[PDB]
Design a protein around this ligand. Sequence first.
Ligand code: 8AU
Ligand code: 8AU
Ligand code: PLG
Ligand code: PLG
Ligand code: CL
Lengths: 442, 442
Amino acid sequence: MFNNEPLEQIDKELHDILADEEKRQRETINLIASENLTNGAVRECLGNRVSNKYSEGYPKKRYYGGNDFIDKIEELCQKRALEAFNVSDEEWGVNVQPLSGSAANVQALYALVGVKGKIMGMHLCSGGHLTHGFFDEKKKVSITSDMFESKLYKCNSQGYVDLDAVREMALSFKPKVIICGYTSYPRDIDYQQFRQICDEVNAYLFADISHISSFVACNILNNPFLHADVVTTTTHKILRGPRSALIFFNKKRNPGIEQKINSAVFPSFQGGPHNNKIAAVACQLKEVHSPAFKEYTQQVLLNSKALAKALISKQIDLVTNGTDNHLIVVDLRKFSITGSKLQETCNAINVSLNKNTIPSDVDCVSPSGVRIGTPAMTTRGAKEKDMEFIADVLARAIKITVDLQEQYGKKLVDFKKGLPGNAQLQQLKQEVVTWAGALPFP
Amino acid sequence: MFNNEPLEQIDKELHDILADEEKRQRETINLIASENLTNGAVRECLGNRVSNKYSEGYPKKRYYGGNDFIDKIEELCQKRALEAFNVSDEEWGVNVQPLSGSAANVQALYALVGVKGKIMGMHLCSGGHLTHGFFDEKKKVSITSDMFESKLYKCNSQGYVDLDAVREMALSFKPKVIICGYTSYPRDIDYQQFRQICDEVNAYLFADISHISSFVACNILNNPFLHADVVTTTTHKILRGPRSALIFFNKKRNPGIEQKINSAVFPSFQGGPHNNKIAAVACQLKEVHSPAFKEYTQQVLLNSKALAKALISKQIDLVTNGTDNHLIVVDLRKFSITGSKLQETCNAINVSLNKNTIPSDVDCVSPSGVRIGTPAMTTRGAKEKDMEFIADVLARAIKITVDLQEQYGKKLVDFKKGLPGNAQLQQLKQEVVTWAGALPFP
Ligand SMILES: Cc1[nH]nc2c1[C@](c1cc(-c3ccccc3Cl)cc(C(F)(F)F)c1)(C(C)C)C(C#N)=C(N)O2
Ligand SMILES: Cc1[nH]nc2c1[C@](c1cc(-c3ccccc3Cl)cc(C(F)(F)F)c1)(C(C)C)C(C#N)=C(N)O2
Ligand SMILES: Cc1ncc(COP(=O)(O)O)c(CNCC(=O)O)c1O
Ligand SMILES: Cc1ncc(COP(=O)(O)O)c(CNCC(=O)O)c1O
Ligand SMILES: [Cl-]
């Protein structure tokens, strides 16, 4: 007693917007540092009937039966996760149930500290995540600043984590957790130095590696699993999986952490896991442990170096003057245009990027930068030689943005009136679409 | 630079478990009250490339651009939701971003009361959800009992919500929210009477309708939108959508609630929404507003009544001696077998059901009942006449379960040893498989 008519027949209205969405993806230069493109096999998992099943609890300790095939899938996912991140399952555990990155972080933090517990993370404006304890004078913006008592550290004037300031803050604040790993930090992390600071005050070391997960997995960047008590990561950014998350916990350093984390995820915070997610995560993690994927990750970094170099060649400033990873933050202060103006300009030319704060910015109103990254375009087949074209398109968007600011003025409402119909944008959009449109598309 | 080989080719290991799991579903009498089966079009949405997009924020107030097509999908979903539940978009708002039922409840509760806020819900042992404030003498099991201060109301000896106990508790406890709508409650709810209790103490009325959502949308059962401040619901149970959730809020009755709830979902708790989920929710919500789906929901109730009646005809006791909805709780005390035993026996015959407390049980340890429901088998085409066969199969399972307990003893470890290779189970399993396998499968 159901309608099994295909999506196009059942709902033509929805199917047109989704076919439109797909066209826009195929014809966009996607520089969102956090975005990627899933393959068909991952998308077959996400649409699999396995999501019909309720499987509350954990494998071999389920509330319901009928979960033997679900149990194999969840155990396969956990093992492939540990294999992927070069960890022994005798020393490390993984929970694969968190529905997304923010949920994973709130759950892990709760496990370690409980309500009113003390946490330390990087300020949002300096490249930390919202779930790393973010608040504002106006409000406790994240639950992580409200259900916990948080204190926030800044990066220095050159865009670098200031360990001396982290030390100063930890000794006066005495937190139970210190969070590292960030949302828009262009350099590698000194986890060793973080671990030394956590020992000094007796806090746990939490590494959120969502942005750099593939660099850790493939031994291209520093390894937080050598020093951290907990590692969280999303599966959807550079890892190129579905939208989900993983919490890793160090059993050897913390006996009985396994129960704290598993009970935090369920039944403290979640109900039924989404088994289509877990299935999809299994599928991608098998690709992650191939040497073919180490090739892809290596290319991400090669494109990112090449892009940073080409942008600097065109006299565009980068925060920390370069990158050790997949992402770059452009400092737009020498042009006297804000980040949101360039995002608007880049939207008009099918270039996807986001506004981003820089060290000099005190207020999240009018961030002076944009963040860009290469995972998506690297997935679509772009090489080092292709980064000059992207750098050129970005230089051309900055110049147009500067022209429009002079013509229509510095206020944002006025500025946007300048965008539609602009011959140069229409021309530049055209060049973008034609180039992006041609690239392989999963 | 990706592997686009189909799932069978790229991961033959995962694909065999999935193909097995699909067979187990096709060959099971699925009586899980919270389960259903998604059609092909909803599963096309869940595997759609729309999940590649990061779209933090709300439509027309997004942190990024490139979200024109995402915004159309999210607005279509909110509209179709309000229409489905017969509410005016001038008086009611809806948030469609929550990733699951539990997330939605925690978010909504936080919005209304904040950290340390006082909440009241039905005890879990009496049929409430974990996210309705559940705790135990050993621990604060849910976050909703920990981030909030909760008090839990019981149902009476006959399995009914005891309003005089709710009132007495509300007046002494003075909570900011009173939660109604349950996980295993076989009757309709007196929302009007709850509204009268909340008004008396100046608390919000929160209706969790996840189990009965289709009955509310189709006007078959009472309408909580007449009296509630907030209504939450999952989209995956009787509604037959993907795994996601909805939070409804009464703007007329509470000016300024719209902001409290939207901000609580993001950026307080979540990050990026899962747009495949939202697309999927949109697709199903179109089906919900057809008269064809009203027919389906009517049949759910018809099958549930017929099933209740056939079970009573065979001298099986039901909590509250019947049902007003899709679910029944069987009271197994007269046979001296526990709910976990019958769950194991039913697993052995490809009958999916869960163990469930009954009023007499002091503890959640050794529940004396099972919960069953008709949405899944109603989706598979079963009619009133087919309920006698399910009732037959269930009575036969109880009798086998009673025999095995005699033979191997009342201890669960001893009991289970009698299940593999039992001639009658192999026989009964065989009958189940043959009948179940034949039914329409979406
Ligand atoms: C959207 C998001 N999520 N997590 C995030 C961000 C970012 C961000 C957040 C926010 C914001 C501020 C207050 C409340 C809620 C939010 Cl989402 C603002 C901007 C700005 F527009 F100002 F550039 C940007 C970014 C990646 C887009 C961010 C930065 N920089 C970091 N470090 O982390
Ligand atoms: C699994 C689950 N989620 N939400 C739930 C349930 C149930 C349930 C919960 C629990 C439990 C108890 C303590 C801690 C954690 C959990 Cl998950 C136990 C049982 C039992 F097996 F004993 F019958 C059952 C049910 C639907 C399966 C339930 C009941 N009854 C209710 N009212 O609500
Ligand atoms: C370090 C980090 N951790 C957690 C999250 C949360 O993931 P979900 O959105 O799945 O909740 C993000 C989001 N990153 C947003 C961005 O960089 O664009 C992140 O950057
Ligand atoms: C009333 C109610 N509310 C919220 C939830 C949570 O939904 P998620 O699992 O999507 O978090 C449930 C789950 N119900 C479990 C069952 O009845 O089988 C529920 O019964
Ligand atoms: Cl999903």
